[PDB]
Design a protein around this ligand. Structure first.
Ligand code: CLA
Ligand code: CLA
Ligand code: CLA
Ligand code: CLA
Ligand code: CLA
Ligand code: CLA
Ligand code: CLA
Ligand code: CLA
Ligand code: CLA
Ligand SMILES: CC1=C(/C=C/C(C)=C/C=C/C(C)=C/C=C/C=C(C)/C=C/C=C(C)/C=C/C2=C(C)CCCC2(C)C)C(C)(C)CCC1
Ligand code: SF4
Lengths: 160, 41, 63, 203, 192, 80, 91
């Protein structure tokens, strides 16, 4: 796909694993083998070897630079590069957008609506932050019932 | 607590407590699950 | 004159900040010759910081 | 009536008429007027597809463990060959699902409209309530009619057996994803060492 | 009555032949657009019902499908074999200039009718057998659009079978389907 | 120089005159408000154009309005 | 090949379309669109002496109103099609 070799069989990706441990191994040569800063570089090497063995096992595509490239078209092999964490993101981002929208409706029908935005009512906030879990069923539910959008006759419009 | 919790519910304190929890969570995700470029699930 | 005191009106004036906005009537002047007798109070201020403005009955409808 | 949470106020929309009502709408997914008519029809197909799902996931796998059917596992049943192509059987299903669900779609939208036959109109369905198509094709024994207190109990028994099957089928799905073992063998591996075969050990 | 229980819209009352109320997107909502759509649905269908015998009967008699009998014009020499016989006047500039003259004279004379009903069904010279001046008139117009929409769906089938399976024709798609019908369907096109 | 125009939305609150630093505006009698007075700009040739009157006008939108036109030594604010 | 027959037949086909087929289509459109109009008046009516529509050049003796401009328009398409055909054949 797109002229990119897989990273498990890429010679450039294995070259970057070789020259990263060798950079960290030469950093280890000036420390005692049981010393505290040498345990951090030894944990860095095992973090590096975990990283390169994770990138090759996920079917990542590596170019001529030896670097893993993401295919965001919507490929059946490449769902976890953009499509799977994008749907994970939009669920979380729609959770932020739904509990901030539902908080403003809950404080617009209050005695002092502007004091509830500088001082956020946490019992009112936390009872709808739980309610933002099921938000695609509540956003399209408000879209189908007409409560999501406001009619243009009740919207402040600058003159022509 | 009729006014101490009101101060604790203000916009800068609740931004500090949420983003302290938010960056506290995302750092601790990045410790046990580091170098995460591809979601496997 | 005016719609009603203490009623909810919507502003039809194009150049006001509160165009297509819900406002509450607080005073209507019954003296003849006054161009903008209906005094409408709004929950939100404009850029000048005021919420009190005078409109004609032709620039308001009951909502 | 009993509720899902003692000491919690029941929502104003779930008033207790609906069979299976335990005041369980914490996230307010059926608040809106006219919305609870759609969410019962959604619950009824999902509960009946899950009881159809649980009878095809657990019962042939249990009888495979006894060994009187030798049926393959349900998560490997899509790889099994038949007299038809597996891709072909998808589209023949959704042409038949285009008929059966759109007749069901008009019943939710316009109740009392599609109880008559499209071909031979003397054959009419005897169901009166929305979501309960009584007739010779669906209720040949006539168990869907009687007193309203008697009818509420058997409608309560559909959804309580149905919500268990939904949880069941959702359980088999995640079990086959992280353990890759069929769910009757997951039960039999839990009656041997229960404290070592747990969701934390299977991650 | 394209959906039992569905409310038919106000611009589709049922008095039209074939008025089954099928307009979910509301394309015929404009009244003057809807009068053009009724004379467009019938010319299309009548060309489609002149096309289904023009596809199957050349294929069933063995002179190829409607694609391989059409590729001769792109070839510098194709000689225009008709019923197994090459016509002498079958050159691409010859048969296109006649088609851009004879059909254009036919379509310009068709568009010249001011009556919005004689544009639909003209009669007279176009009805020499006198079935329009008979006892049944409404059900034959319902017969026109039910046969016409079937051939309109058929020509849509005809076209997308050639895109999905190039080099084969609709009776050859029928002969492929008649051998092993549970393996070779639209799912071969949907699922590659 | 500058053209200062008063519109009929004025309530006669007088604060456009009080904010004026070059004595352009004055309050004349009128019949279109409760205060029975409207502003006017007779000495509009003395207008610097600072729009302090527009900053002090509480009417939405503004009743006093200053249009920056041809600028002379009055409206440039020079002492040399 | 055959330049003298291909050009003549293709010009004669487009002139047959211009006189007998598309002449009610062209005469209706030059009356529905009309003269070009700026601000409610014609360009010649607004003061442009060079925008006057010529009538001596448009004075036709054809009974259907087919003038020498339509000869120069439909015959130009018959040569554009005629040299489309001759270039396609000679390849
Ligand atoms: C309460 C939640 C809320 C909701 C649901 C939205 C939703 C909307 N905003 Mg946003 N916005 C908000 C908060 C919110 N905003 C706040 C707090 C700010 C100040 C930073 C803005 C500043 C803003 C800008 C500058 C723009 C939008 C626009 C948009 C639209 C697209 C989303 C977007 O551009 O990314 C979000 C944009 C941001 C700048 C991020 C702010 C979101 C914060 C982090 C959420 C805070 C919520 C929390 C309870 C406090 C959409 C109508 C765009 C528009 O005009 O509509 C098409 C646009 O141009 N918004
Ligand atoms: C919208 C822009 C954007 C996007 C798509 C990402 C997304 C990502 N970055 Mg990030 N990053 C960004 C902006 C962005 N970054 C910026 C602005 C900074 C500077 C503060 C960084 C610095 C940063 C750090 C230091 C780390 C991430 C990491 C990550 C991953 C997060 C994995 C997890 O569970 O947490 C993910 C691939 C982590 C990772 O796994 O790297 C791949 C990690 O190491 N990023
Ligand atoms: C898609 C599944 C589905 C659907 C259509 C509903 C529909 C209904 N349920 Mg529910 N129910 C289900 C699953 C479902 N149920 C299961 C599996 C359980 C057992 C855990 C229950 C337990 C239950 C109780 C005890 C009661 C309800 C009731 C309600 C009603 C109001 C709340 C609502 O609209 O929820 C709408 C729900 C959805 C649209 C599903 C959203 C799922 C989100 C997107 C993800 C959730 C992830 C999941 C946990 C894994 C409505 C008839 C009340 C009632 O009166 O019933 C007649 C009642 O008191 N339910
Ligand atoms: C919606 C519910 C559902 C679905 C998806 C299926 C679908 C499947 N089951 Mg299953 N099953 C179900 C409910 C379900 N089952 C129920 C209600 C029972 C009865 C308790 C069974 C009993 C059962 C047996 C006994 C076997 C299957 C098998 C099959 C497969 C082909 C069905 C067949 O032979 O055509 C039937 C066609 C008809 C027209 C009838 C397919 C994977 C077979 C299999 O795994 O392949 C070898 C198999 O032998 N199922
Ligand atoms: C636990 C099983 C269960 C239960 C309690 C019921 C209960 C009900 N169903 Mg339901 N339903 C179920 C399974 C269930 N259904 C499933 C799996 C499907 C899909 C095939 C259906 C499809 C369905 C429809 C569409 C209709 C009903 C109707 C009926 C009602 C009268 C029939 C009756 O008494 O069934 C008793 C059920 C059993 C004894 C279970 C048998 C289990 C075998 C042995 C396996 C009653 C409310 C009818 C109705 O209300 O019409 C008025 C109706 O026509 N149901
Ligand atoms: C009808 C409900 C029900 C029943 C009786 C079972 C029964 C069983 N499941 Mg479970 N499962 C359920 C629903 C169900 N499940 C649901 C809804 C999920 C999806 C989130 C799972 C996901 C799941 C995993 C991933 C695992 C099991 C496994 C198990 C066994 C040990 C319990 C455990 O550690 O996981 C309990 C996990 C839960 C999330 C509890 C949910 C149960 C409530 C009633 C719903 C046990 C035999 C384990 C196994 O393979 O056994 C050897 C195992 O690895 N299940
Ligand atoms: C070009 C062909 C053509 C045109 C002009 C129309 C025109 C019309 N049809 Mg239609 N029809 C046709 C083909 C055609 N149809 C075929 C192919 C089908 C079978 C699937 C039907 C089935 C159908 C029914 C059952 C009914 C109509 C009716 C209608 C009328 C109102 C709906 C409308 O405005 O549709 C406008 C449609 C178009 C402009 C066609 C183009 C659509 C887009 C641009 C492309 C679509 C691509 C397609 C999905 C593949 C109008 C006379 C109703 C009526 O009263 O009939 C008299 C009626 O109830 N039609
Ligand atoms: C819209 C209708 C229409 C169109 C344009 C076509 C077009 C075509 N058909 Mg066809 N056909 C039609 C309807 C039509 N057919 C119908 C309804 C029948 C049944 C009578 C036939 C039976 C028919 C046969 C049997 C043959 C054609 C052939 C032809 C081709 C040459 C025609 C020719 O030489 O002119 C002839 C002009 C006159 C006789 C005048 C041409 C591509 C030939 C073909 O496909 O190539 C092998 C062929 O052999 N057609
Ligand atoms: C009324 C006209 C009509 C009829 C009787 C046929 C008949 C045939 N077509 Mg066709 N086709 C139609 C319309 C029709 N089609 C339309 C409009 C489409 C576009 C969606 C196609 C798309 C199409 C393809 C590309 C293929 C067929 C195939 C087939 C076979 C049926 C198997 C299948 O997958 O059906 C599919 C039928 C539909 C999706 C719609 C059918 C609607 C009618 C009214 C029922 C059969 C020989 C297959 C074949 O034989 O090739 C191997 C094949 O793969 N057709
Ligand atoms: C029948 C008749 C008649 C006659 C007529 C005639 C004879 C006509 C002719 C006509 C003609 C004779 C015409 C022509 C025309 C032509 C033209 C008009 C041309 C043009 C051309 C063009 C323009 C072209 C172009 C081009 C070029 C140049 C180059 C490049 C390419 C092209 C091709 C594009 C009469 C009157 C007696 C009357 C009676 C009847
Ligand atoms: S400040 Fe504005 S409202 Fe007040 S008197 Fe001057 S012009 Fe009128």
């Amino acid at each position: 796909v797109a002229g990119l070799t897989p990273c498990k069989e890429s010679k450039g990706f294995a070259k970057r694993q070789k020259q990263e441990i060798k950079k960290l191994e030469g950093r280890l040569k000036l420390y005692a083998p049981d010393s505290a800063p040498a345990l951090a570089i030894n944990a860095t090497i095992e973090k590096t070897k975990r990283r390169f063995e994770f990138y090759g096992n996920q079917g990542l595509l590596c170019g001529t630079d030896g670097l893993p490239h993401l295919i965001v078209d919507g490929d059946q092999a490449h769902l976890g590069e953009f499509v799977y964490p994008g749907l994970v993101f939009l669920y979380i981002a729609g959770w932020i957008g739904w509990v901030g929208r539902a908080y403003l409706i809950d404080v617009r029908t209050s005695k002092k609506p502007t004091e509830k935005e500088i001082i956020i009512d946490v019992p009112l906030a936390l009872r709808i932050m739980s309610k933002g879990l099921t938000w695609p069923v509540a956003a399209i539910g408000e879209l189908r019932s007409g409560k999501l959008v406001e009619k243009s006759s009740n919207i402040t419009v600058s003159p022509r | 607590m009729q006014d101490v919790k009101t101060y604790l519910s203000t916009a800068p304190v609740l931004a500090t407590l949420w983003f302290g929890f938010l960056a506290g969570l995302l750092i601790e995700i990045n410790r046990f699950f580091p170098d995460a470029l591809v979601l496997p699930l | 004159i005016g719609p009603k005191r203490g009623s909810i009106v919507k502003v039809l004036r194009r150049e006001s900040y509160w165009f297509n906005d819900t406002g509450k009537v607080v005073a209507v002047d019954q003296a003849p010759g006054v161009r903008y007798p209906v005094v409408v109070r709004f929950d939100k201020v404009n850029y000048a910081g005021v919420s009190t403005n005078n409109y004609s009955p032709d620039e308001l409808e009951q909502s | 009536r009993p509720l899902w949470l003692p000491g919690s106020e029941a929502p104003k929309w779930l008033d207790g008429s609906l069979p299976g009502d335990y005041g369980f709408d914490p996230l307010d997914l059926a608040a809106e007027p006219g919305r609870l008519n759609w969410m019962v029809q959604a619950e009824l197909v999902h509960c009946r597809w899950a009881m159809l799902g649980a009878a095809g996931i657990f019962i042939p796998e249990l009888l495979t463990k006894i060994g009187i059917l030798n049926t393959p596992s349900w998560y490997k049943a899509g790889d099994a060959t038949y007299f038809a192509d597996q891709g072909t059987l998808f589209i023949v299903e959704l042409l038949l699902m285009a008929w059966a669900e759109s007749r069901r779609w008009a019943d939710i939208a316009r109740p009392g409209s599609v109880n008559t036959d499209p071909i031979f109109p003397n054959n009419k369905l005897t169901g009166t309530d929305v979501g309960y198509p009584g007739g010779l094709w669906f209720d040949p024994l006539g168990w869907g009619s009687g007193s309203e207190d008697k009818l509420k109990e058997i409608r309560t028994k559909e959804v309580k057996n149905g919500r268990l099957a939904m949880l069941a089928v959702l359980g088999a799905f995640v079990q086959a994803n992280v353990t890759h073992v069929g769910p009757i063998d997951n039960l039999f591996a839990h009656l041997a060492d229960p404290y070592h075969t747990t969701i934390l050990q299977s991650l | 009555e394209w959906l039992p229980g569905n409310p038919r819209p106000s611009y589709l009352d049922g008095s039209a032949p074939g008025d089954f109320g099928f307009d979910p997107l509301g394309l015929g909502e404009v009244p003057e657009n809807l009068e053009r759509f009724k004379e467009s649905e019938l010319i299309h269908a009548r060309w489609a019902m002149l096309a289904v015998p023009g596809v199957l009967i050349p294929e069933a008699l063995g002179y190829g499908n409607w694609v391989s009998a059409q590729k001769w014009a792109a070839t510098p020499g194709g000689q225009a074999t008709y019923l197994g016989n090459p016509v002498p006047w079958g050159n691409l500039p010859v048969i296109l200039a006649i088609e851009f003259l004879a059909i254009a004279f036919a379509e310009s004379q068709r568009n010249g009718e001011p009556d919005p009903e004689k544009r639909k069904y003209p009669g007279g010279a176009f009805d020499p057998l006198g079935f329009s001046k008979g006892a049944n008139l409404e059900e034959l117009k319902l017969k026109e659009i039910k046969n016409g929409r079937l051939a309109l769906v058929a020509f849509l089938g005809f076209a997308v079978q050639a895109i999905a399976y190039p080099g084969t024709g609709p009776l050859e798609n029928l002969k492929t389907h008649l051998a092993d019908p549970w393996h070779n369907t639209i799912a071969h096109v949907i699922i590659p | 120089a500058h053209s200062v125009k008063i519109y009929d939305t004025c309530i006669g609150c007088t604060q456009c005159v009080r904010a004026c630093p070059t004595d352009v505006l004055e309050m004349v009698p009128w019949d279109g408000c409760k205060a029975s007075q409207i502003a006017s700009a007779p000495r509009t040739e003395d207008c610097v154009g600072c729009k302090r009157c527009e900053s002090a006008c509480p009417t939405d939108f503004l009743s006093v309005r200053v249009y920056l036109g041809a600028e002379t030594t009055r409206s440039m604010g020079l002492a040399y | 090949a055959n330049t003298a027959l291909t050009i003549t037949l293709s010009t004669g086909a487009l002139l047959f379309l211009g006189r007998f087929v598309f002449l009610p289509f062209q005469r209706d459109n030059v009356s529905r669109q009309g003269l070009p109009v700026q601000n409610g008046v014609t360009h010649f009516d607004a003061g442009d002496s060079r925008a006057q529509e010529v009538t001596s050049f448009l004075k036709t003796n054809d009974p259907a109103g087919f003038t020498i401009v339509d000869v120069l328009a439909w015959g130009a398409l018959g040569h554009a099609v005629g040299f489309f055909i001759l270039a396609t054949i000679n390849n």
